[PDB]
Design an enzyme around this catalytic site. Sequence first.
Site, PDB file in Angstrom:
ATOM      1  N   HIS A 149     -12.552  -0.643 -13.385  1.00 44.18           N
ATOM      2  CA  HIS A 149     -11.283  -1.139 -13.892  1.00 44.18           C
ATOM      3  C   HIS A 149     -10.982  -2.384 -13.029  1.00 44.18           C
ATOM      4  CE1 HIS A 149      -7.046  -1.705 -14.061  1.00 44.18           C
ATOM      5  NE2 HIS A 149      -7.043  -1.023 -15.251  1.00 44.18           N
ATOM      6  N   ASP A 195      -8.383  -3.908 -11.677  1.00 39.06           N
ATOM      7  CA  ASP A 195      -7.576  -3.753 -10.469  1.00 39.06           C
ATOM      8  C   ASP A 195      -8.349  -2.981  -9.426  1.00 39.06           C
ATOM      9  OD1 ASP A 195      -5.213  -5.072 -11.427  1.00 39.06           O
ATOM     10  OD2 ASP A 195      -4.513  -3.194 -12.427  1.00 39.06           O
ATOM     11  N   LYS A 196      -9.056  -1.915  -9.812  1.00 35.09           N
ATOM     12  CA  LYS A 196      -9.818  -1.117  -8.867  1.00 35.09           C
ATOM     13  C   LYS A 196     -10.991  -1.898  -8.283  1.00 35.09           C
ATOM     14  CE  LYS A 196      -7.809   2.499  -7.495  1.00 35.09           C
ATOM     15  NZ  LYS A 196      -7.847   1.903  -6.117  1.00 35.09           N
ATOM     16  N   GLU A 224      -6.267  -9.919  -0.033  1.00 30.28           N
ATOM     17  CA  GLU A 224      -6.019  -9.637  -1.444  1.00 30.28           C
ATOM     18  C   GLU A 224      -7.182 -10.181  -2.270  1.00 30.28           C
ATOM     19  OE1 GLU A 224      -3.580  -7.888  -1.513  1.00 30.28           O
ATOM     20  OE2 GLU A 224      -1.765  -8.675  -0.541  1.00 30.28           O
ATOM     21  N   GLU A 266      -4.971 -13.269   4.829  1.00 29.99           N
ATOM     22  CA  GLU A 266      -4.978 -13.635   6.240  1.00 29.99           C
ATOM     23  C   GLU A 266      -5.858 -12.676   7.003  1.00 29.99           C
ATOM     24  OE1 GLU A 266      -1.802 -12.459   4.801  1.00 29.99           O
ATOM     25  OE2 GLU A 266      -1.795 -14.357   3.721  1.00 29.99           O
ATOM     26  N   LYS A 297     -10.417   4.298 -18.058  1.00 28.56           N
ATOM     27  CA  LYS A 297      -9.107   4.863 -17.735  1.00 28.56           C
ATOM     28  C   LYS A 297      -9.043   6.236 -18.304  1.00 28.56           C
ATOM     29  CE  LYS A 297      -5.537   2.108 -17.572  1.00 28.56           C
ATOM     30  NZ  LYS A 297      -4.415   1.212 -18.115  1.00 28.56           N
ATOM     31  N   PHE A 312     -13.791  -1.012 -27.544  1.00 29.98           N
ATOM     32  CA  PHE A 312     -13.600  -1.463 -26.154  1.00 29.98           C
ATOM     33  C   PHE A 312     -14.916  -1.998 -25.619  1.00 29.98           C
ATOM     34  CE2 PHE A 312     -11.801   0.636 -21.860  1.00 29.98           C
ATOM     35  CZ  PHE A 312     -11.912  -0.554 -21.183  1.00 29.98           C
ATOM     36  N   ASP A 350      -9.089  -8.086 -18.801  1.00 27.92           N
ATOM     37  CA  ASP A 350      -7.778  -7.898 -18.192  1.00 27.92           C
ATOM     38  C   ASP A 350      -7.883  -8.335 -16.737  1.00 27.92           C
ATOM     39  OD1 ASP A 350      -5.150  -6.704 -17.831  1.00 27.92           O
ATOM     40  OD2 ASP A 350      -6.084  -4.836 -17.072  1.00 27.92           O
ATOM     41  N   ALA A 351      -7.051  -9.301 -16.301  1.00 23.89           N
ATOM     42  CA  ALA A 351      -7.071  -9.694 -14.894  1.00 23.89           C
ATOM     43  C   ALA A 351      -6.802  -8.506 -13.970  1.00 23.89           C
ATOM     44  CB  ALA A 351      -6.010 -10.771 -14.633  1.00 23.89           C
ATOM     45  N   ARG A 363      -2.539  -2.917  -7.358  1.00 19.37           N
ATOM     46  CA  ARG A 363      -1.925  -2.682  -8.646  1.00 19.37           C
ATOM     47  C   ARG A 363      -2.164  -1.296  -9.229  1.00 19.37           C
ATOM     48  NH1 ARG A 363       0.247  -7.336 -11.462  1.00 19.37           N
ATOM     49  NH2 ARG A 363       0.065  -5.982 -13.278  1.00 19.37           N
ATOM     50  N   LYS A 364      -2.709  -0.392  -8.415  1.00 18.69           N
ATOM     51  CA  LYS A 364      -2.965   1.002  -8.849  1.00 18.69           C
ATOM     52  C   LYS A 364      -2.452   1.928  -7.724  1.00 18.69           C
ATOM     53  CE  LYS A 364      -4.545   0.455 -12.869  1.00 18.69           C
ATOM     54  NZ  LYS A 364      -3.484  -0.640 -13.002  1.00 18.69           N
ATOM     55  N   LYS A 398      -6.127  -3.798   4.112  1.00 21.79           N
ATOM     56  CA  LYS A 398      -5.252  -3.820   5.280  1.00 21.79           C
ATOM     57  C   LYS A 398      -5.774  -2.963   6.399  1.00 21.79           C
ATOM     58  CE  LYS A 398      -1.103  -4.148   2.344  1.00 21.79           C
ATOM     59  NZ  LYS A 398       0.116  -3.371   1.932  1.00 21.79           N
ATOM     60  N   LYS A 429      -1.014  -2.315   9.553  1.00 20.78           N
ATOM     61  CA  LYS A 429      -0.176  -2.368   8.385  1.00 20.78           C
ATOM     62  C   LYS A 429       0.167  -0.903   8.058  1.00 20.78           C
ATOM     63  CE  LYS A 429      -2.129  -6.584   8.147  1.00 20.78           C
ATOM     64  NZ  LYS A 429      -2.748  -7.183   9.326  1.00 20.78           N
ATOM     65  N   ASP A 465       1.886   0.355   5.841  1.00 19.82           N
ATOM     66  CA  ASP A 465       1.785   0.792   4.435  1.00 19.82           C
ATOM     67  C   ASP A 465       0.599   1.747   4.253  1.00 19.82           C
ATOM     68  OD1 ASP A 465       3.785  -0.740   3.202  1.00 19.82           O
ATOM     69  OD2 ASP A 465       2.433  -2.460   3.044  1.00 19.82           O
TER      70      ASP A 465
HETATM   71  C1  SAM Z   1      -5.119  -2.824 -22.113  1.00 25.35           C
HETATM   72  S1  SAM Z   1      -5.340  -3.733 -20.697  1.00 25.35           S
HETATM   73  C2  SAM Z   1      -3.809  -4.314 -20.242  1.00 25.35           C
HETATM   74  C3  SAM Z   1      -3.108  -5.259 -21.246  1.00 25.35           C
HETATM   75  C4  SAM Z   1      -3.837  -6.609 -21.360  1.00 25.35           C
HETATM   76  N1  SAM Z   1      -3.747  -7.406 -20.111  1.00 25.35           N
HETATM   77  C5  SAM Z   1      -3.461  -7.482 -22.572  1.00 25.35           C
HETATM   78  O1  SAM Z   1      -3.770  -8.701 -22.517  1.00 25.35           O
HETATM   79  O2  SAM Z   1      -2.914  -6.980 -23.581  1.00 25.35           O
HETATM   80  C6  SAM Z   1      -5.428  -2.570 -19.453  1.00 25.35           C
HETATM   81  C7  SAM Z   1      -6.722  -1.824 -19.039  1.00 25.35           C
HETATM   82  O3  SAM Z   1      -7.072  -1.004 -20.170  1.00 25.35           O
HETATM   83  C8  SAM Z   1      -8.473  -0.999 -20.388  1.00 25.35           C
HETATM   84  N2  SAM Z   1      -8.861  -1.726 -21.618  1.00 25.35           N
HETATM   85  C9  SAM Z   1      -9.253  -3.032 -21.759  1.00 25.35           C
HETATM   86  N3  SAM Z   1      -9.567  -3.293 -23.038  1.00 25.35           N
HETATM   87  C10 SAM Z   1      -9.361  -2.141 -23.698  1.00 25.35           C
HETATM   88  C11 SAM Z   1      -9.534  -1.746 -25.095  1.00 25.35           C
HETATM   89  N4  SAM Z   1     -10.029  -2.604 -26.021  1.00 25.35           N
HETATM   90  N5  SAM Z   1      -9.243  -0.475 -25.389  1.00 25.35           N
HETATM   91  C12 SAM Z   1      -8.784   0.385 -24.468  1.00 25.35           C
HETATM   92  N6  SAM Z   1      -8.598   0.129 -23.162  1.00 25.35           N
HETATM   93  C13 SAM Z   1      -8.869  -1.135 -22.784  1.00 25.35           C
HETATM   94  C14 SAM Z   1      -9.098  -1.670 -19.205  1.00 25.35           C
HETATM   95  O4  SAM Z   1      -9.318  -0.615 -18.241  1.00 25.35           O
HETATM   96  C15 SAM Z   1      -7.994  -2.637 -18.792  1.00 25.35           C
HETATM   97  O5  SAM Z   1      -8.173  -3.045 -17.426  1.00 25.35           O
HETATM   98  C1  SAM Z   2       4.536  -9.312   7.661  1.00 28.27           C
HETATM   99  S1  SAM Z   2       3.887  -9.890   6.203  1.00 28.27           S
HETATM  100  C2  SAM Z   2       2.641  -8.821   5.762  1.00 28.27           C
HETATM  101  C3  SAM Z   2       1.450  -8.715   6.742  1.00 28.27           C
HETATM  102  C4  SAM Z   2       0.629 -10.016   6.781  1.00 28.27           C
HETATM  103  N1  SAM Z   2      -0.079 -10.275   5.502  1.00 28.27           N
HETATM  104  C5  SAM Z   2      -0.346 -10.167   7.965  1.00 28.27           C
HETATM  105  O1  SAM Z   2      -1.255 -11.030   7.851  1.00 28.27           O
HETATM  106  O2  SAM Z   2      -0.202  -9.487   9.007  1.00 28.27           O
HETATM  107  C6  SAM Z   2       4.974  -9.345   5.007  1.00 28.27           C
HETATM  108  C7  SAM Z   2       6.269 -10.089   4.593  1.00 28.27           C
HETATM  109  O3  SAM Z   2       7.128 -10.041   5.748  1.00 28.27           O
HETATM  110  C8  SAM Z   2       7.813 -11.268   5.932  1.00 28.27           C
HETATM  111  N2  SAM Z   2       7.341 -12.013   7.121  1.00 28.27           N
HETATM  112  C9  SAM Z   2       6.392 -13.000   7.197  1.00 28.27           C
HETATM  113  N3  SAM Z   2       6.287 -13.455   8.455  1.00 28.27           N
HETATM  114  C10 SAM Z   2       7.173 -12.739   9.168  1.00 28.27           C
HETATM  115  C11 SAM Z   2       7.567 -12.756  10.576  1.00 28.27           C
HETATM  116  N4  SAM Z   2       7.040 -13.646  11.453  1.00 28.27           N
HETATM  117  N5  SAM Z   2       8.524 -11.892  10.930  1.00 28.27           N
HETATM  118  C12 SAM Z   2       9.071 -11.033  10.058  1.00 28.27           C
HETATM  119  N6  SAM Z   2       8.789 -10.941   8.748  1.00 28.27           N
HETATM  120  C13 SAM Z   2       7.831 -11.780   8.309  1.00 28.27           C
HETATM  121  C14 SAM Z   2       7.565 -12.090   4.707  1.00 28.27           C
HETATM  122  O4  SAM Z   2       8.615 -11.726   3.783  1.00 28.27           O
HETATM  123  C15 SAM Z   2       6.191 -11.585   4.280  1.00 28.27           C
HETATM  124  O5  SAM Z   2       5.957 -11.883   2.895  1.00 28.27           O
HETATM  125  K     K Z   3      -3.558  -7.471 -15.656  1.00 25.67           K
HETATM  126  K     K Z   4      -0.119  -9.955   1.054  1.00 26.94           K
HETATM  127 MG    MG Z   5      -3.446  -4.036 -13.966  1.00 25.65          MG
HETATM  128 MG    MG Z   6       2.860  -8.105  -0.486  1.00 30.43          MG
HETATM  129 MG    MG Z   7      -1.170   0.398 -15.680  1.00 36.74          MG
HETATM  130 MG    MG Z   8       5.564  -4.025   1.468  1.00 33.81          MG
END
Ligand code: SAM
Ligand code: SAM
Ligand code: K
Ligand code: K
Ligand code: MG
Ligand code: MG
Ligand code: MG
Ligand code: MG
EC number: 2.5.1.6
Lengths: 379, 379
Positions: A13, A15-16, A41, A54, A165, A234, A242-243, A248-249, A269, A273, A275
Amino acid sequence: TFLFTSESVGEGHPDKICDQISDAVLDAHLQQDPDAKVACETVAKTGMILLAGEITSRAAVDYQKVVREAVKHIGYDDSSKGFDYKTCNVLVALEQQSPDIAQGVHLDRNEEDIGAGDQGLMFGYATDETEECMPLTIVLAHKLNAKLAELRRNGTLPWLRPDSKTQVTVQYMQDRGAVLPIRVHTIVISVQHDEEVCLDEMRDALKEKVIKAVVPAKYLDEDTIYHLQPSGRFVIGGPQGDAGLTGRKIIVDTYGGWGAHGGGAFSGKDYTKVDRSAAYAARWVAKSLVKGGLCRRVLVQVSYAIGVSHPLSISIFHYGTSQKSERELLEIVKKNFDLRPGVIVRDLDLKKPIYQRTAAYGHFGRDSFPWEVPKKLKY
Amino acid sequence: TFLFTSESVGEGHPDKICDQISDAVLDAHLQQDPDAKVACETVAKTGMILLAGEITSRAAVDYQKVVREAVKHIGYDDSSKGFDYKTCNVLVALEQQSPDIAQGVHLDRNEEDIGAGDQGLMFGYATDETEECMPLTIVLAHKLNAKLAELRRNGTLPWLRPDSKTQVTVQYMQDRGAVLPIRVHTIVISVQHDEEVCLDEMRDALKEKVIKAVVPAKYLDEDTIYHLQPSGRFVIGGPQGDAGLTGRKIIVDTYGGWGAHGGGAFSGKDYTKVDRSAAYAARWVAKSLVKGGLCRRVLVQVSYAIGVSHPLSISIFHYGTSQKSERELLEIVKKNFDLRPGVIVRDLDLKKPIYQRTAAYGHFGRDSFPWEVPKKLKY
Ligand SMILES: C[S@@+](CC[C@H](N)C(=O)[O-])C[C@H]1O[C@@H](n2cnc3c(N)ncnc32)[C@H](O)[C@@H]1O
Ligand SMILES: C[S@@+](CC[C@H](N)C(=O)[O-])C[C@H]1O[C@@H](n2cnc3c(N)ncnc32)[C@H](O)[C@@H]1O
Ligand SMILES: [K+]
Ligand SMILES: [K+]
Ligand SMILES: [Mg+2]
Ligand SMILES: [Mg+2]
Ligand SMILES: [Mg+2]
Ligand SMILES: [Mg+2]
Ligand SMILES: [K+]
Ligand SMILES: [K+]
């Protein structure tokens, strides 16, 4: 009775794919520099993997090799499948970690007293409805995707492609706050396929070779609803269809809608982090309370401020499934766990490069990762 | 009593920039073609906005103008602030919607019977603890970011920059399943600032001019903990400090950790994507049950399969806050709402180009959007 539904997605998928690439990058850094600071990312669309974020690390990482080897493992190895690790574009927009963040979080700090890498809230959850203390809905949904990848990779269903999916709706009853699965009400499966196989051959295989191979027969009955290849076609799939983006999951990664989520993604991460590290620790606390016989089901919240080591808040919700009060369980948690990130890293061995393994099929409830081994509690 | 924490982020947080750009793109398409199919993801890092995804539309959209005008509105208009709409790179990787998805979802279908644009699960939540039926934690967190943007834009605190985060921990008591806020336990504020202002001037302003201007004095006391600029320095910010992606603030967008979330992002998606339309409808159902006097607090789950119009499952959880059973409330919901996407679009006017307005400060609990106006229930 009530219904509850959870979903999962396969390794291919889009996103995965991104979560697995982000964690392959993190692992490549940790293999050389255990103290790497990583926030990678990944974005995927037709023909492209972009890395953005970063990283401050002493490692020398070949991003083209790491990315392409992860896509090869997933199975995208030919333009006929819509994506090919050999010939896709890999673009890198990676910079050092902000010095302002580094000075406020970890620079010159003793490791146990490193500050949280960001603010945020995180939850842990555990339920005794399965031995692995996870909701049945999400466990089944993950195993249906794992079964599709197994049948693709062993050549049983050679028309399968990596993008899939699934979704499972279970009918439950409640028992004093705990939940008891009764039956599977509905299953959805959508999976990318080749141009030659027909819908009826795929629907028959998905029922006979995937669902019947994964779901215990006791949960399936004459009224179970199946939506198998419900779109009808499909063939285009993966990032071409699909981007994809990292993070995102996040509900697939955790509890399938049960419990709660604080919003933070895991993949890409390092341990600072919170999270990721604090969500893993919260799952470990929740599972320790359930396997310790203190509750049948429990939700744990924690929260942090950037630069501050100790959590700002800790809360325990037991759904009525313990004879102890929630305040008593909080006191037992506070006496048994230290939820600073610089202590969680030691308890859960979070500098080890095992993160790509967590980036599909859920982070919780499988393979006895450290956060899945309960801590024996003293009280 | 127990604690609960929620966070929010400002307009210039890099993930929130992406959600606002994605929704500015969606609005630009809907202004010309109400039936545009849009799935626009945005990525931001130093100097770059990338658009990736799928759009099939009759509109002629100038992406460079849409993106740059959204960044200008947020306030990133000079390299001294770390990002400038006039001079950043805008890259576009947008393709048509997959024909396989189009044929399985909407092609040749009567609008009321259009299939869901994807599978997935979604939740709606409402609580009577505030007039707008939202958790106090998240309402306060959003208003602290809105106050920082107001003070930046009116020139009161000219050292403020657009990127901010807040977090609020409230101490609650329970009352038969409903929750009652008692006091604010902890507040965090982090906001990007210029190179000249000192930490003490910023901490004093954040307490006196932001927190005291937003939080009712009854909730603040001598024991309230403040973490104001806790990192100590935040001059680098926006996408230069941290990569942003669309759909990475899904808990900020909704209930701040309360209720539940099915994982789907809102921004950049047209109504056929049930992640947005059905979550909006579920919030409308939840708020209609609470404002209708049927419960004090309620969670609604719905789920869909791609290509299928009706939800696969609908569940109501009232936390014990109604004299009616959850099955009775489900029957009232089923008699009063039609949760097909092609009916939700009509009830909630979801072809209207108002989505950029939803993409900061939460989608729920403000400005009387259609999903915030209760439906009078018949039972
Ligand atoms: C349906 S798409 C999301 C919506 C899409 N970005 C659009 O442009 O409408 C979401 C996910 O569903 C699955 N997918 C993609 N094409 C599909 C299809 N033809 N039938 C069912 N699932 C699909 C894939 O896993 C995809 O990443
Ligand atoms: C701390 S960053 C996430 C971790 C980061 N990607 C890293 O490289 O460690 C998350 C969010 O916190 C805020 N942020 C960025 N720099 C920061 C700083 N120096 N102090 C506190 N918050 C910060 C911003 O809103 C940023 O989008
Ligand atoms: K997408
Ligand atoms: K980030
Ligand atoms: Mg998605
Ligand atoms: Mg973020
Ligand atoms: Mg979804
Ligand atoms: Mg956060
Ligand atoms: K969480
Ligand atoms: K949701």
